[PDB]
């Protein structure tokens with residue numbers, strides 16, 4: 102039951118758009134707490150300016166899974182939005198990525214990374230080491246067998 106990139110994996114060119122982000126670090130064990138806290142505080146901050154997110158939330162990773170690791174997470178937003186405290190104005194990812202949609206629990210998401218790494222290797226692409234996840238559904242409110250995540254591995258320079 103290994104994911105297959107045969108038909109669904111693709112290379113995307115990502116258009117960078119504005120976002121509000123929390124740029125910090127965490128451990129596997131604190132990641133859920135962190136996201137629930139941060140994602141809520143951002144929404145709160147958006148509402149503070151009578152603004153709404155313009156897209157589902159996302160996270161960026163690098164050197165993940167090992168001890169304490171880097172994470173950037175947030176929401177894409179309309180222009181004119183401003184951050185406050187640790188919530189900052191930045192951008193969504195730009196450039197090329199090897200990308201696939203995944204449906205299922207986040208726990209079994211490793212398989213999609215496996216398949217994406219096989220597919221990158223086969224097609225002779227090179228990775229930056231960065232991963233990009235878009236959480237299309239709120240996991241709290243969404244059945245696991247219906248939970249949509251887009252998984253992207255960022256590609257390296259020319």
Ligand SMILES: CCNc1cc2oc3c/c(=[NH+]\CC)c(C)cc-3c(-c3ccccc3C(=O)OCC)c2cc1C
Nearest residue numbers: 132133136137140141157158207236237238239240241
């Ligand atoms: C259009 C999609 N919109 C959303 C997508 C979301 O994705 C989430 C992914 C997560 N993990 C990804 C690895 C975690 C941990 C929390 C998430 C929350 C979240 C935010 C605040 C409070 C609780 C949760 C929440 O879902 O509780 C977590 C059990 C969330 C919320 C919304 C609105």
